[PDB]
C-alpha cells in the first residue's frame, strides 16, 4: 500500500480535491546544481546529483530554481555567481516532457533571482520571466494560470505551479503571485501572508544554522505542520543548510546526516501533515537509512 514504490506517479494517486498546500511534497534545494562535476568546486555548491528528469522519476515535485538574467530573453540557472550550465528553458522542457508523461502530476516551480544580471540585460528578471517564459507560446498549457489562490491538485494536475520568490510580479496564478511578492526573512523561521492575505506562508529557511540547530529547526516546523490542517497555510521547510551545518565535510556529507534523521521523525509521525520539505541530494538513499523523499511521499493519507 506504500505510495513511493512508484515515485514517478505518486500524486496521480492522491485526492485531486486536496489543496496543494495540504500535500506533503518533497523538493530539491538548488535543483539544477546537479550539473557540477568538479569534485572540488562541488563541496558546498553541489546540492543534488540527479537531473530534473530523474529527480522527477524519483518523486520530486517542488523544484528550487535559481536564476540570473544573462539576456533580456534568457534566464540562466545559477548558484549565485556560479553558472550551472543550462537555461531556465532546460528545466521547463524536461518538466513539460514529464507532466506530458505523467499528466496527473503537478510541479511547483520556485523561481528566485540568485544573481545580478549581465550588462547587456535591460528588463528586470521578473519582466524577463513574465515576458519570455511564463507568457510564452511553447509553455502555454504547462503553467497554471488559474484564478484560485488555494489551487487544487485537480486544478493544477499537469501544470507547473509558481512558488514565486522574484518579488512583485504581474503574474496572478501560483504562490505569492501578486504585486507585493513574498517577503522572505534572511536565515530564519518566519511567517507571512501571500497572494493578498489569502495564504499564510510559514517557512523554515534558517540556512546558516549549525547542524544540531538546523535539525531542531526543521522538527520545530514539522511539529507545527503536523497539527495544522488549515488549507490556507503553506509550509515550506528547508532541510538544506550552508557549510555542512558546520558539522560536516560536504553538503553531500551533511545531506547524509540530516535526511535520514528527519526521515525517522516523519516516519514516527505516520500519516500526518508535514508540508513541503526541500532537501539537498534528493532521491539519494544510503543502505540502511530511511529516505526523506520516500517518507515524505508515504506520509500522505491518500485513501481511508
Ligand atoms: O543560501 C540560501 C539557501 O539557498 C536558501 O535555500 C535560500 O532560500 C536562500 O535565499 C539562500 O540565501
Swiss-Prot record:
GO terms for biological process: lipid catabolic process. Residues 16-165 form the PI-PLC X-box domain. The active site is at residues 29, 79. PANTHER family: PTHR13593, SI:DKEY-266F7.9. Cleaves glycosylphosphatidylinositol (GPI) and phosphatidylinositol (PI) anchors but not PI phosphates. Potential virulence factor. It catalyses: a 1,2-diacyl-sn-glycero-3-phospho-(1D-myo-inositol) = 1D-myo-inositol 1,2-cyclic phosphate + a 1,2-diacyl-sn-glycerol. One of its GO terms (molecular function) is phosphoric diester hydrolase activity. InterPro entries: PI-PLC_domain (IPR051057), PLC-like_Pdiesterase_TIM-brl (IPR017946), PLipase_C_PInositol-sp_X_dom (IPR000909). This is 1-phosphatidylinositol phosphodiesterase. GO terms for cellular component: extracellular region. It is found in: Secreted. Its EC number is 4.6.1.13. Transmembrane segments: none annotated. Keywords: Lipid degradation, Lipid metabolism, Lyase, Secreted, Signal, Virulence. Its main location: secreted. SUPFAM superfamilies: PLC-like phosphodiesterases.
Amino acid at each position: 500500500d506504500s505510495l513511493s514504490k512508484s515515485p514517478e506517479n505518486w500524486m496521480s494517486k492522491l485526492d485531486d480535491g486536496k489543496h496543494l498546500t495540504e500535500i506533503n511534497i518533497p523538493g530539491s534545494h538548488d535543483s539544477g546544481s546537479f550539473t557540477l562535476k568538479d569534485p572540488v568546486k562541488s563541496v558546498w555548491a553541489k546540492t543534488q546529483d540527479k537531473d530534473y528528469l530523474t529527480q522527477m522519476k524519483s518523486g520530486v515535485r517542488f523544484f528550487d530554481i535559481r536564476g540570473r538574467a544573462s539576456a533580456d530573453n534568457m534566464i540562466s540557472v545559477h548558484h549565485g555567481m556560479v553558472y550551472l550550465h543550462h537555461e531556465l528553458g532546460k528545466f521547463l522542457d524536461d518538466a513539460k516532457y514529464y507532466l506530458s508523461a505523467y499528466p496527473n502530476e503537478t510541479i511547483v516551480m520556485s523561481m528566485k533571482k540568485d544573481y545580478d544580471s549581465d550588462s547587456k540585460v535591460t528588463k528586470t528578471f521578473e519582466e524577463i520571466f513574465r515576458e519570455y517564459y511564463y507568457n510564452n507560446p511553447q509553455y502555454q498549457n504547462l503553467f497554471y494560470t488559474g484564478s484560485n489562490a488555494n489551487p487544487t491538485l485537480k486544478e493544477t494536475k499537469g501544470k507547473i505551479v509558481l512558488f514565486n520568490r522574484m518579488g512583485g510580479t504581474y503574474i496572478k496564478s501560483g504562490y505569492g503571485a501578486d504585486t507585493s511578492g513574498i517577503q522572505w526573512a534572511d536565515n530564519a523561521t518566519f511567517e507571512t501572508k501571500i497572494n493578498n492575505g489569502s495564504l499564510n506562508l510559514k517557512v523554515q529557511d534558517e540556512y546558516k544554522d549549525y547542524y544540531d540547530k538546523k535539525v531542531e529547526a526543521v522538527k520545530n516546523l514539522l511539529a507545527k505542520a503536523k497539527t495544522d490542517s488549515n488549507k490556507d497555510n503553506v509550509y515550506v521547510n528547508f532541510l538544506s543548510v550552508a557549510s555542512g551545518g558546520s558539522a560536516f565535510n560536504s553538503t553531500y556529507n551533511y545531506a547524509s546526516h540530516i535526511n535520514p534523521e528527519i526521515a525517522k521523525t516523519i516516519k514516527a509521525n505516520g500519516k500526518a501533515r508535514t508540508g513541503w520539505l526541500i532537501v539537498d541530494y534528493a532521491g539519494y538513499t544510503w543502505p540502511g537509512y530511511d529516505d526523506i523523499v520516500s517518507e515524505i511521499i508515504d506520509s500522505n493519507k491518500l485513501e481511508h
